[PDB]
Each structure stands twice: as C-alpha cells, then as structure tokens.
Amino acid sequence: MPLVDFFCETCSKPWLVGWWDQFKR
C-alpha cells in the first residue's frame, strides 16, 4: 500500500487533529 500509506497520513482524519495540538510536545 503505497498511496494508501500517505492517504491516511493526512486525509479523512480532520477530527484527530484535535488531540494533535497537544502532541506538539
């Protein structure tokens, strides 16, 4: 899974970006 690897990397997961803010550390 080549393109499918970068697809989930940053795509339909705009809801996870919420607990990503704290991941800044």
PDB file of all heavy atoms in Angstrom:
ATOM      1  N   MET A   1       0.861  -1.216   0.000  1.00  0.00           N
ATOM      2  CA  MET A   1       0.000   0.000   0.000  1.00  0.00           C
ATOM      3  C   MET A   1       0.885   1.251   0.000  1.00  0.00           C
ATOM      4  O   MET A   1       1.308   1.711   1.042  1.00  0.00           O
ATOM      5  CB  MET A   1      -0.887   0.006   1.241  1.00  0.00           C
ATOM      6  CG  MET A   1      -1.264  -1.429   1.622  1.00  0.00           C
ATOM      7  SD  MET A   1      -1.932  -1.452   3.304  1.00  0.00           S
ATOM      8  CE  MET A   1      -3.033  -0.026   3.133  1.00  0.00           C
ATOM      9  N   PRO A   2       1.149   1.749  -1.178  1.00  0.00           N
ATOM     10  CA  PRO A   2       1.995   2.936  -1.376  1.00  0.00           C
ATOM     11  C   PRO A   2       1.192   4.224  -1.181  1.00  0.00           C
ATOM     12  O   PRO A   2       1.396   4.958  -0.235  1.00  0.00           O
ATOM     13  CB  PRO A   2       2.450   2.798  -2.832  1.00  0.00           C
ATOM     14  CG  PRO A   2       1.406   1.897  -3.537  1.00  0.00           C
ATOM     15  CD  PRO A   2       0.630   1.164  -2.427  1.00  0.00           C
ATOM     16  N   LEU A   3       0.294   4.508  -2.078  1.00  0.00           N
ATOM     17  CA  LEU A   3      -0.513   5.751  -1.961  1.00  0.00           C
ATOM     18  C   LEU A   3      -1.456   5.651  -0.762  1.00  0.00           C
ATOM     19  O   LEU A   3      -1.784   6.639  -0.137  1.00  0.00           O
ATOM     20  CB  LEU A   3      -1.330   5.930  -3.236  1.00  0.00           C
ATOM     21  CG  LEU A   3      -0.505   6.704  -4.265  1.00  0.00           C
ATOM     22  CD1 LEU A   3      -0.215   5.805  -5.466  1.00  0.00           C
ATOM     23  CD2 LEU A   3      -1.290   7.932  -4.725  1.00  0.00           C
ATOM     24  N   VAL A   4      -1.898   4.469  -0.438  1.00  0.00           N
ATOM     25  CA  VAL A   4      -2.820   4.316   0.721  1.00  0.00           C
ATOM     26  C   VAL A   4      -2.071   4.653   2.011  1.00  0.00           C
ATOM     27  O   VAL A   4      -2.669   4.921   3.035  1.00  0.00           O
ATOM     28  CB  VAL A   4      -3.327   2.875   0.784  1.00  0.00           C
ATOM     29  CG1 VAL A   4      -4.576   2.810   1.664  1.00  0.00           C
ATOM     30  CG2 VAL A   4      -3.675   2.397  -0.627  1.00  0.00           C
ATOM     31  N   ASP A   5      -0.768   4.649   1.970  1.00  0.00           N
ATOM     32  CA  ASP A   5       0.014   4.974   3.196  1.00  0.00           C
ATOM     33  C   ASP A   5       0.006   6.489   3.411  1.00  0.00           C
ATOM     34  O   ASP A   5      -0.160   6.970   4.514  1.00  0.00           O
ATOM     35  CB  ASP A   5       1.456   4.491   3.028  1.00  0.00           C
ATOM     36  CG  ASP A   5       2.317   5.048   4.163  1.00  0.00           C
ATOM     37  OD1 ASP A   5       1.776   5.278   5.232  1.00  0.00           O
ATOM     38  OD2 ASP A   5       3.503   5.236   3.944  1.00  0.00           O
ATOM     39  N   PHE A   6       0.184   7.244   2.363  1.00  0.00           N
ATOM     40  CA  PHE A   6       0.186   8.727   2.501  1.00  0.00           C
ATOM     41  C   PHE A   6      -1.256   9.235   2.565  1.00  0.00           C
ATOM     42  O   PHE A   6      -1.520  10.326   3.031  1.00  0.00           O
ATOM     43  CB  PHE A   6       0.892   9.345   1.293  1.00  0.00           C
ATOM     44  CG  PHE A   6       1.584  10.620   1.710  1.00  0.00           C
ATOM     45  CD1 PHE A   6       2.481  10.610   2.784  1.00  0.00           C
ATOM     46  CD2 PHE A   6       1.330  11.812   1.022  1.00  0.00           C
ATOM     47  CE1 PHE A   6       3.124  11.793   3.169  1.00  0.00           C
ATOM     48  CE2 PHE A   6       1.972  12.994   1.407  1.00  0.00           C
ATOM     49  CZ  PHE A   6       2.869  12.985   2.481  1.00  0.00           C
ATOM     50  N   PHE A   7      -2.190   8.453   2.098  1.00  0.00           N
ATOM     51  CA  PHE A   7      -3.612   8.892   2.129  1.00  0.00           C
ATOM     52  C   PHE A   7      -4.076   9.026   3.582  1.00  0.00           C
ATOM     53  O   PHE A   7      -4.521  10.074   4.004  1.00  0.00           O
ATOM     54  CB  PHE A   7      -4.480   7.860   1.401  1.00  0.00           C
ATOM     55  CG  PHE A   7      -5.161   8.517   0.224  1.00  0.00           C
ATOM     56  CD1 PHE A   7      -4.788   8.171  -1.080  1.00  0.00           C
ATOM     57  CD2 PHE A   7      -6.165   9.470   0.435  1.00  0.00           C
ATOM     58  CE1 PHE A   7      -5.419   8.778  -2.173  1.00  0.00           C
ATOM     59  CE2 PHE A   7      -6.795  10.077  -0.658  1.00  0.00           C
ATOM     60  CZ  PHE A   7      -6.422   9.731  -1.962  1.00  0.00           C
ATOM     61  N   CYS A   8      -3.973   7.977   4.353  1.00  0.00           N
ATOM     62  CA  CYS A   8      -4.406   8.055   5.778  1.00  0.00           C
ATOM     63  C   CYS A   8      -3.486   9.010   6.536  1.00  0.00           C
ATOM     64  O   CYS A   8      -3.875   9.615   7.515  1.00  0.00           O
ATOM     65  CB  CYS A   8      -4.334   6.664   6.413  1.00  0.00           C
ATOM     66  SG  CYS A   8      -5.843   6.357   7.365  1.00  0.00           S
ATOM     67  N   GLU A   9      -2.269   9.159   6.088  1.00  0.00           N
ATOM     68  CA  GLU A   9      -1.333  10.083   6.780  1.00  0.00           C
ATOM     69  C   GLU A   9      -2.064  11.388   7.091  1.00  0.00           C
ATOM     70  O   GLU A   9      -2.171  11.797   8.230  1.00  0.00           O
ATOM     71  CB  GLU A   9      -0.143  10.369   5.866  1.00  0.00           C
ATOM     72  CG  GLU A   9       1.141  10.379   6.693  1.00  0.00           C
ATOM     73  CD  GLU A   9       1.792   8.995   6.643  1.00  0.00           C
ATOM     74  OE1 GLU A   9       1.647   8.330   5.631  1.00  0.00           O
ATOM     75  OE2 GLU A   9       2.422   8.623   7.619  1.00  0.00           O
ATOM     76  N   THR A  10      -2.576  12.041   6.084  1.00  0.00           N
ATOM     77  CA  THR A  10      -3.308  13.316   6.317  1.00  0.00           C
ATOM     78  C   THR A  10      -4.494  13.411   5.351  1.00  0.00           C
ATOM     79  O   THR A  10      -4.380  13.958   4.272  1.00  0.00           O
ATOM     80  CB  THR A  10      -2.363  14.497   6.085  1.00  0.00           C
ATOM     81  OG1 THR A  10      -3.057  15.713   6.330  1.00  0.00           O
ATOM     82  CG2 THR A  10      -1.864  14.475   4.640  1.00  0.00           C
ATOM     83  N   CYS A  11      -5.626  12.873   5.722  1.00  0.00           N
ATOM     84  CA  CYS A  11      -6.806  12.930   4.805  1.00  0.00           C
ATOM     85  C   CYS A  11      -8.136  13.009   5.572  1.00  0.00           C
ATOM     86  O   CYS A  11      -8.543  14.063   6.020  1.00  0.00           O
ATOM     87  CB  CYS A  11      -6.820  11.681   3.950  1.00  0.00           C
ATOM     88  SG  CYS A  11      -5.864  11.961   2.440  1.00  0.00           S
ATOM     89  N   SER A  12      -8.837  11.902   5.687  1.00  0.00           N
ATOM     90  CA  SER A  12     -10.159  11.901   6.372  1.00  0.00           C
ATOM     91  C   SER A  12     -10.005  11.954   7.887  1.00  0.00           C
ATOM     92  O   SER A  12     -10.917  11.604   8.611  1.00  0.00           O
ATOM     93  CB  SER A  12     -10.901  10.618   6.014  1.00  0.00           C
ATOM     94  OG  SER A  12     -11.341  10.688   4.664  1.00  0.00           O
ATOM     95  N   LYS A  13      -8.884  12.376   8.397  1.00  0.00           N
ATOM     96  CA  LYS A  13      -8.770  12.410   9.892  1.00  0.00           C
ATOM     97  C   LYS A  13      -8.635  13.847  10.461  1.00  0.00           C
ATOM     98  O   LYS A  13      -7.833  14.092  11.336  1.00  0.00           O
ATOM     99  CB  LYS A  13      -7.614  11.506  10.355  1.00  0.00           C
ATOM    100  CG  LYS A  13      -6.249  12.196  10.291  1.00  0.00           C
ATOM    101  CD  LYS A  13      -5.906  12.563   8.860  1.00  0.00           C
ATOM    102  CE  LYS A  13      -6.260  14.024   8.648  1.00  0.00           C
ATOM    103  NZ  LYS A  13      -5.050  14.795   8.244  1.00  0.00           N
ATOM    104  N   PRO A  14      -9.474  14.744   9.996  1.00  0.00           N
ATOM    105  CA  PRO A  14      -9.506  16.144  10.482  1.00  0.00           C
ATOM    106  C   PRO A  14     -10.098  16.196  11.892  1.00  0.00           C
ATOM    107  O   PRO A  14     -10.171  17.240  12.508  1.00  0.00           O
ATOM    108  CB  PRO A  14     -10.417  16.856   9.478  1.00  0.00           C
ATOM    109  CG  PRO A  14     -11.277  15.753   8.826  1.00  0.00           C
ATOM    110  CD  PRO A  14     -10.466  14.451   8.953  1.00  0.00           C
ATOM    111  N   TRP A  15     -10.502  15.071  12.413  1.00  0.00           N
ATOM    112  CA  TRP A  15     -11.068  15.051  13.793  1.00  0.00           C
ATOM    113  C   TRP A  15      -9.938  14.711  14.760  1.00  0.00           C
ATOM    114  O   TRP A  15      -9.961  15.075  15.919  1.00  0.00           O
ATOM    115  CB  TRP A  15     -12.176  13.994  13.925  1.00  0.00           C
ATOM    116  CG  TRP A  15     -12.298  13.193  12.669  1.00  0.00           C
ATOM    117  CD1 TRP A  15     -11.724  11.988  12.446  1.00  0.00           C
ATOM    118  CD2 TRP A  15     -13.028  13.530  11.466  1.00  0.00           C
ATOM    119  NE1 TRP A  15     -12.068  11.563  11.174  1.00  0.00           N
ATOM    120  CE2 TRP A  15     -12.873  12.485  10.529  1.00  0.00           C
ATOM    121  CE3 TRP A  15     -13.803  14.639  11.109  1.00  0.00           C
ATOM    122  CZ2 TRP A  15     -13.476  12.538   9.271  1.00  0.00           C
ATOM    123  CZ3 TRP A  15     -14.412  14.703   9.845  1.00  0.00           C
ATOM    124  CH2 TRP A  15     -14.249  13.653   8.928  1.00  0.00           C
ATOM    125  N   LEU A  16      -8.946  14.013  14.279  1.00  0.00           N
ATOM    126  CA  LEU A  16      -7.798  13.637  15.146  1.00  0.00           C
ATOM    127  C   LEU A  16      -6.912  14.851  15.372  1.00  0.00           C
ATOM    128  O   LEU A  16      -6.193  14.944  16.347  1.00  0.00           O
ATOM    129  CB  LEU A  16      -6.966  12.565  14.453  1.00  0.00           C
ATOM    130  CG  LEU A  16      -7.880  11.506  13.845  1.00  0.00           C
ATOM    131  CD1 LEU A  16      -7.033  10.320  13.376  1.00  0.00           C
ATOM    132  CD2 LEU A  16      -8.879  11.037  14.901  1.00  0.00           C
ATOM    133  N   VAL A  17      -6.949  15.777  14.466  1.00  0.00           N
ATOM    134  CA  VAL A  17      -6.099  16.986  14.611  1.00  0.00           C
ATOM    135  C   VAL A  17      -6.425  17.678  15.932  1.00  0.00           C
ATOM    136  O   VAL A  17      -5.678  18.506  16.414  1.00  0.00           O
ATOM    137  CB  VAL A  17      -6.357  17.944  13.445  1.00  0.00           C
ATOM    138  CG1 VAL A  17      -7.835  18.332  13.417  1.00  0.00           C
ATOM    139  CG2 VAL A  17      -5.505  19.204  13.622  1.00  0.00           C
ATOM    140  N   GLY A  18      -7.535  17.339  16.521  1.00  0.00           N
ATOM    141  CA  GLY A  18      -7.914  17.970  17.814  1.00  0.00           C
ATOM    142  C   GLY A  18      -6.924  17.552  18.895  1.00  0.00           C
ATOM    143  O   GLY A  18      -6.359  18.386  19.576  1.00  0.00           O
ATOM    144  N   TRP A  19      -6.686  16.277  19.069  1.00  0.00           N
ATOM    145  CA  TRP A  19      -5.711  15.882  20.116  1.00  0.00           C
ATOM    146  C   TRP A  19      -4.293  15.910  19.541  1.00  0.00           C
ATOM    147  O   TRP A  19      -3.360  15.404  20.133  1.00  0.00           O
ATOM    148  CB  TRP A  19      -6.035  14.508  20.727  1.00  0.00           C
ATOM    149  CG  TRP A  19      -6.391  13.474  19.711  1.00  0.00           C
ATOM    150  CD1 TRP A  19      -7.619  12.924  19.566  1.00  0.00           C
ATOM    151  CD2 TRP A  19      -5.530  12.808  18.750  1.00  0.00           C
ATOM    152  NE1 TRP A  19      -7.565  11.963  18.577  1.00  0.00           N
ATOM    153  CE2 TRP A  19      -6.299  11.856  18.039  1.00  0.00           C
ATOM    154  CE3 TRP A  19      -4.173  12.939  18.423  1.00  0.00           C
ATOM    155  CZ2 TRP A  19      -5.736  11.058  17.046  1.00  0.00           C
ATOM    156  CZ3 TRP A  19      -3.606  12.141  17.420  1.00  0.00           C
ATOM    157  CH2 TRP A  19      -4.384  11.202  16.732  1.00  0.00           C
ATOM    158  N   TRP A  20      -4.117  16.548  18.411  1.00  0.00           N
ATOM    159  CA  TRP A  20      -2.755  16.670  17.820  1.00  0.00           C
ATOM    160  C   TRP A  20      -2.121  17.931  18.397  1.00  0.00           C
ATOM    161  O   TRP A  20      -0.938  17.996  18.656  1.00  0.00           O
ATOM    162  CB  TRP A  20      -2.849  16.836  16.303  1.00  0.00           C
ATOM    163  CG  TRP A  20      -2.795  15.522  15.614  1.00  0.00           C
ATOM    164  CD1 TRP A  20      -2.514  14.353  16.196  1.00  0.00           C
ATOM    165  CD2 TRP A  20      -3.029  15.233  14.212  1.00  0.00           C
ATOM    166  NE1 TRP A  20      -2.567  13.354  15.239  1.00  0.00           N
ATOM    167  CE2 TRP A  20      -2.878  13.852  13.998  1.00  0.00           C
ATOM    168  CE3 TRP A  20      -3.356  16.038  13.124  1.00  0.00           C
ATOM    169  CZ2 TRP A  20      -3.046  13.282  12.735  1.00  0.00           C
ATOM    170  CZ3 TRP A  20      -3.528  15.481  11.846  1.00  0.00           C
ATOM    171  CH2 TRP A  20      -3.373  14.102  11.652  1.00  0.00           C
ATOM    172  N   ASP A  21      -2.923  18.941  18.591  1.00  0.00           N
ATOM    173  CA  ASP A  21      -2.407  20.219  19.149  1.00  0.00           C
ATOM    174  C   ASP A  21      -1.495  19.921  20.345  1.00  0.00           C
ATOM    175  O   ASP A  21      -0.380  20.399  20.419  1.00  0.00           O
ATOM    176  CB  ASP A  21      -3.595  21.085  19.593  1.00  0.00           C
ATOM    177  CG  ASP A  21      -3.130  22.146  20.595  1.00  0.00           C
ATOM    178  OD1 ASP A  21      -2.686  23.193  20.156  1.00  0.00           O
ATOM    179  OD2 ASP A  21      -3.225  21.891  21.785  1.00  0.00           O
ATOM    180  N   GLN A  22      -1.959  19.140  21.281  1.00  0.00           N
ATOM    181  CA  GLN A  22      -1.119  18.819  22.471  1.00  0.00           C
ATOM    182  C   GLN A  22       0.106  18.008  22.038  1.00  0.00           C
ATOM    183  O   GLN A  22       1.164  18.102  22.629  1.00  0.00           O
ATOM    184  CB  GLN A  22      -1.944  18.007  23.470  1.00  0.00           C
ATOM    185  CG  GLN A  22      -2.234  16.623  22.890  1.00  0.00           C
ATOM    186  CD  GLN A  22      -2.837  15.733  23.980  1.00  0.00           C
ATOM    187  OE1 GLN A  22      -2.532  15.890  25.145  1.00  0.00           O
ATOM    188  NE2 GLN A  22      -3.686  14.800  23.648  1.00  0.00           N
ATOM    189  N   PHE A  23      -0.027  17.211  21.014  1.00  0.00           N
ATOM    190  CA  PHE A  23       1.131  16.391  20.546  1.00  0.00           C
ATOM    191  C   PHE A  23       2.317  17.299  20.193  1.00  0.00           C
ATOM    192  O   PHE A  23       3.422  16.834  19.998  1.00  0.00           O
ATOM    193  CB  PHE A  23       0.724  15.590  19.302  1.00  0.00           C
ATOM    194  CG  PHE A  23       1.968  15.074  18.613  1.00  0.00           C
ATOM    195  CD1 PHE A  23       2.467  13.802  18.919  1.00  0.00           C
ATOM    196  CD2 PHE A  23       2.629  15.879  17.678  1.00  0.00           C
ATOM    197  CE1 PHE A  23       3.626  13.336  18.289  1.00  0.00           C
ATOM    198  CE2 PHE A  23       3.790  15.414  17.049  1.00  0.00           C
ATOM    199  CZ  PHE A  23       4.288  14.142  17.355  1.00  0.00           C
ATOM    200  N   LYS A  24       2.105  18.583  20.092  1.00  0.00           N
ATOM    201  CA  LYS A  24       3.231  19.494  19.734  1.00  0.00           C
ATOM    202  C   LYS A  24       4.464  19.196  20.595  1.00  0.00           C
ATOM    203  O   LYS A  24       5.569  19.567  20.255  1.00  0.00           O
ATOM    204  CB  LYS A  24       2.800  20.950  19.909  1.00  0.00           C
ATOM    205  CG  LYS A  24       2.089  21.117  21.248  1.00  0.00           C
ATOM    206  CD  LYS A  24       2.989  21.911  22.189  1.00  0.00           C
ATOM    207  CE  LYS A  24       2.529  23.369  22.230  1.00  0.00           C
ATOM    208  NZ  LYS A  24       1.187  23.449  22.873  1.00  0.00           N
ATOM    209  N   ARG A  25       4.292  18.522  21.695  1.00  0.00           N
ATOM    210  CA  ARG A  25       5.467  18.196  22.555  1.00  0.00           C
ATOM    211  C   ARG A  25       5.845  16.730  22.350  1.00  0.00           C
ATOM    212  O   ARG A  25       6.852  16.423  21.745  1.00  0.00           O
ATOM    213  CB  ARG A  25       5.129  18.417  24.035  1.00  0.00           C
ATOM    214  CG  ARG A  25       4.179  19.606  24.196  1.00  0.00           C
ATOM    215  CD  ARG A  25       3.060  19.227  25.166  1.00  0.00           C
ATOM    216  NE  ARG A  25       2.411  17.965  24.710  1.00  0.00           N
ATOM    217  CZ  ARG A  25       1.302  17.560  25.268  1.00  0.00           C
ATOM    218  NH1 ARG A  25       0.755  18.261  26.224  1.00  0.00           N
ATOM    219  NH2 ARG A  25       0.739  16.452  24.867  1.00  0.00           N
TER     220      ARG A  25
END
